Design a protein around this ligand. Sequence first.
Ligand code: ATP
Ligand code: MG
Lengths: 136, 117, 284, 366, 73, 52, 52
Amino acid sequence: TYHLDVVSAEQQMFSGLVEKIQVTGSEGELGIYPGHAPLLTAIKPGMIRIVKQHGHEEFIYLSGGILEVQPGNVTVLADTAIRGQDLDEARAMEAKRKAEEHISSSHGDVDYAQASAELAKAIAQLRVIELTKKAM
Amino acid sequence: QLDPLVVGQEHYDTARGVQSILQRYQELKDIIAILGMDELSEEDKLVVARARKIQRFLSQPFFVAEVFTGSPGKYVSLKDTIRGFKGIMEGEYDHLPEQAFYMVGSIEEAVEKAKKL
Amino acid sequence: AGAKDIRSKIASVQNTQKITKAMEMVAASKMRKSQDRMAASRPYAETMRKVIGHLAHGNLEYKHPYLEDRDVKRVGYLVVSTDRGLAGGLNINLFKKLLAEMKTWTDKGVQADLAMIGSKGVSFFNSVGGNVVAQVTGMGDNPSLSELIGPVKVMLQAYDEGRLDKLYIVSNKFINTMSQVPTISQLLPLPASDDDDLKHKSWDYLYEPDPKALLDTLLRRYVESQVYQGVVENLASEQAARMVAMKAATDNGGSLIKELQLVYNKARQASITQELTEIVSGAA
Amino acid sequence: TGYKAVDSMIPIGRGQRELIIGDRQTGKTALAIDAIINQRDSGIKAIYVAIGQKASTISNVVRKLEEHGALANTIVVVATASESAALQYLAPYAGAAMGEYFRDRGEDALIIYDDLSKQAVAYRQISLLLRRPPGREAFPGDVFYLHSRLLERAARVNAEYVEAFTKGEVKGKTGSLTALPIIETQAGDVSAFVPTNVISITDGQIFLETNLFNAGIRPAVNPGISVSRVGGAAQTKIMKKLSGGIRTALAQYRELAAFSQFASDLDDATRKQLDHGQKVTELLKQKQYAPMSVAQQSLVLFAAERGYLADVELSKIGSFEAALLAYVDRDHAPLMQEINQTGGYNDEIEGKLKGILDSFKATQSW
Amino acid sequence: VNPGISVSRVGGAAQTKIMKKLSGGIRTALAQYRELAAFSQFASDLDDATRKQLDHGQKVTELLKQKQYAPMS
Amino acid sequence: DLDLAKASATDQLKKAKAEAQVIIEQANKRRSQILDEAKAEAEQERTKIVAQ
Amino acid sequence: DLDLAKASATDQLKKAKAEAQVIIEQANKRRSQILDEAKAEAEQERTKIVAQ
Ligand SMILES: Nc1ncnc2c1ncn2[C@@H]1O[C@H](COP(=O)(O)OP(=O)(O)OP(=O)(O)O)[C@@H](O)[C@H]1O
Ligand SMILES: [Mg+2]
């Protein structure tokens, strides 16, 4: 057996011991057994099959990534979203538009909003200084 | 005298529901202010509108206030009051504008004003 | 003064102190969750940086624009900022450090371009008048990489298209649970590695399909990860800075209670005596 | 007192003085007359002294006393809001003498003084009309010695005292008189003059909170700030066992639920304390004229403390409580009898109560 | 003059109908401004919808200011 | 089928308990009606006997 | 293991059928208890009001 990592930029996805894997490399299907020579390739979006030792089979969906295999080791630097020349250019276009305008969104921290507004009403017009003879 | 035993369960439930809706709206008001309304959940975006319509509907034109406003006054029976609030809270009038409830008498004037509005 | 007016203000300050204690607790939990998510992100960058170091500085070192120091005429910054207040001085410390380093650059006559993460930085830099060119805001508790893709893409495109000649990220480093520091670090051209992979002499990869396109993709993904890491470290720095700030505000409230209660005691004593003296002196 | 909240959290003893204190219209008079109505079918004779009350309140009080059959037990002493201040000032002492008659004969009495704060106002009026010098808030100097020398008559007297007083006609009995003075605060400022005097006189206070009362939490007893300094010595053993935690559990639940509003997505450990507290706080309210016997309260509290709520924790816990009482009243009445007669608590009774709730949860509905 | 804390029980009956017409929006604008006044110390935490009310109520308050001995017709 | 039997037993129990609750609320409504009838009869009986 | 599954499924269905019949029989018992108690209180109130 050998060690397999499926790692995204955000969080890890698999860290077990494996007997073999099957992937779609960009240049075709590819099946890594133990001891396999060092290799580096992209992988296409789609499923990877793991057979954990004792023969347990499972399927992991990957939005892409890079596969790198080493003496006794392999890693799949999986992408977290579909990547492409057009999708990424559309996202950059929206990121540019939002800056050429002055449009901004609202954070989802409703807890911060509640506490912020309660504190803003509570602290308003205390008149506590001059009432307290603190100079400062 | 506001308890089920003397006013009946219908009146008591209508009153407690109105107070609960208005309290929930008073809670949501600051989230609306900081975050903006488009962040509220779709059931809270409905509590807001229904509370805002309740808050309009319990205003009323008086016969003696006419010299202040010129508009005629209206007398509303308790049955019509309960029927109107019980309808609003249950969503029977989610299709009317808010200003259809402002300074009206019975709910019939609300539907007729919206039809005119 | 007035005894009732003071007691009302005492109640209002106690209510403020209670709110700030709750905010301290919430921040102290969000900080732990955020700094664990921070550790969940290391393996991707570490293993990719070892691969890039093997391709770029090892044997058969390939040539790429991102690797080498072309002459600089204008500079790009990715700036991370919060969407929220009550964080203390954190964003203003970072933005003043940026404006100092950017002014030193503009002494030499070079131009500078900014891309923003978070609404605070957008507001501040537009008030200052900085040249923001791309932005993402409203990340909240949940910073995605698939939203970082945009502004990082704009700055990478501007680099390979030959406009930007150096690229920085500007962020707070989380170091201790009460210590964070504003930093500027170079993303591109790629920082020099300390380590030498001469011990990787003994092997080389089977590069399928071809090493140069694969090194191009590797470098693009690595810059992305390093930016995401800078966002998550700044978010945990935000939670810790809010925790400390709400602690200090709760102690300030507790001192103000003492000072208001002293004034209330004096007021109620004076009221008792001024009344009883009026009564007794009125009885001829 | 027949109220789950008081009888569990704030036990009252024969010869204790417990101050019912709270803002206007928070169930002070209701709680007092329900205590009187509970005294029906006990050796305790009840006295109700109404000071400054409007006559419609007294008419209602007497109708409810006779309706629930408690009137044959109790003396009603009336000094209405329109009667001369002399009658209002000197009333509680008449009530105290009528109660002390029973106390000195080796019997038990209970007396309620409705609005001692109105007695203090009537004594202030009668004092100022006699040109006597005023004090902190125009109340005369001895207003403390007004309330003190009244409340100190509420006492438990030993068998030698009653034997010597009655000239040997009664030997084994100990007499007692229990006072429940009512005080009205303004906006809950406990630290006012007459409230902090009466709090310095009595042995505890049942503080009734207005923002709990308006939220439908009736009776609105406030834990923490309310205490009985006589405490568990007066309490019966089964109630002392079951109730030990309830007060601190409720106070910490209230502070935690105050924190909660600012903290969504909160630890799943406190998520359970903050549920169990919200169920116990929902369970302890009850209807206007419904006094509950020690066995009924005990088994409801056993149900709440030993987790039998946690599935029904959803809702309809009021219907659950009513159905549980009706089920136990149908089958296991010989146990309700044992509990009401002895108040004792045993591992055998613990097992019996487990068997009752197991059979109820599996076989009935609410 | 502190509006809203200050009262006239005569109201519009003592106003020309042009003034009576125009004054109601001033009253509602200042009432909304007074309600939304607290948030003003944290203005750039707010939403734009409430922000437009807050900075409108400031402009009305600024418009009422007037120099002594210059009565207006 | 073992897990389907489990879902059938739990559905049968909850169906029977809701079906019992409609019987109980029918008894409660009947009680409220018959006590209101008894009260209205005692009201009229009083008005007649006090006039006499 | 299939023969065990059939035994377990039939036993649990027998238990749920018994428990449903117990629940509804006790619901009818409760309803009868309520209706008797309401008859007694109907006369207790009427006698109270006429004596008043
Ligand atoms: N447990 C309860 N459930 C439902 N209603 C209640 C309860 N206790 C009191 N009420 C209602 O609340 C109202 C106020 O009760 P009560 O008259 O006892 O208050 P109070 O404090 O004695 O009044 P005041 O202070 O004005 O003399 C009454 O209408 C009463 O019926
Ligand atoms: Mg009262």
